[PDB]
């Protein structure tokens, strides 16, 4: 890999610089290089990895949606034939997106997840695994769609089971995991009732634990709780 000659600490330093410069592709490459050093990641380092790839894939998802919408409109009755270009370019963006997802899943499998023993790291990585299978699911068409959905579900479920056993209901990782699993249910799995139930229970159990928290932890937890509430408003 191109980052094989750079020190781990230098890669982390440059990832932080790239974040400041809003150079997320570079940030992702630097964090990939850091992971490939083979050492476990700290909490801050895990978060850098997450931010970098979320921003990269986020760009791709937004683009793919634009192109997919144009494509669907071309396939309506009364629409003028414009040749293969829309499909071709949507396919190009889609392939790049799938490549980014595969890269992240590869890092998790080789070997972040297997070395992660603490609840905070293991849940973080398993949530990521769910997330990147969910992003694959967004663009998947057919039966391979089914296996991708099941892979996302399985990762989220394993993460949920650990988080419920090992973390307080207000833990931001636990909250973010439940939020994203609820989005999976609603947006991917055609299970809006499961989504609503999960969001409601997550919100209520966190509410009841807020009293245990410092002012700063309270702010961190309530930020994510508000997103659960925003979704419940959207969904009901």
């Amino acid at each position: 890999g191109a980052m094989g000659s750079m020190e781990r600490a230098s890669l982390i330093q440059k990832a932080k610089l790239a974040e400041q410069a809003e150079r997320y592709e570079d940030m992702a490459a630097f964090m990939k290089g850091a992971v490939e050093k083979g050492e476990e990641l700290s909490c801050e380092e895990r978060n850098l990895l997450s931010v970098a790839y979320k921003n990269v894939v986020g760009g791709q998802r937004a683009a793919w949606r634009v192109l997919s919408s144009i494509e669907q409109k071309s396939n309506e009755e009364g629409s003028e034939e414009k040749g293969p270009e829309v499909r071709e370019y949507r396919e190009k963006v889609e392939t790049e997106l799938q490549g980014v997802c595969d890269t992240v899943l590869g890092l998790l499998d080789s070997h972040l997840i297997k070395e992660a023993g603490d609840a905070e790291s293991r849940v973080f990585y398993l949530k990521m695994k769910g997330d990147y299978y969910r992003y694959l699911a967004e663009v998947a068409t057919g039966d391979d769609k089914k296996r991708i959905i099941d892979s996302a579900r399985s990762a989220y479920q394993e993460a949920m089971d650990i988080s419920k056993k090992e973390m307080p209901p207000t833990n931001p990782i636990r909250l973010g995991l439940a939020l994203n699993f609820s989005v999976f249910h609603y947006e991917i799995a055609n299970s809006p009732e499961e989504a609503i139930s999960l969001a409601k229970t997550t919100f209520d159990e966190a509410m009841a634990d807020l009293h245990t928290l410092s002012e700063d932890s309270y702010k961190d937890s309530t930020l994510i709780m508000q997103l659960l509430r925003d979704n419940l408003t959207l969904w009901t």
Binding site: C43, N47, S50, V51, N55, P172, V183, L227, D230, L234
Partner: peptide
């Protein structure tokens, strides 16, 4: 309007 997932935050 799509559902909101977890943003970039610690």
């Amino acid at each position: 309007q799509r559902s909101t997932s977890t943003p970039n935050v610690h």
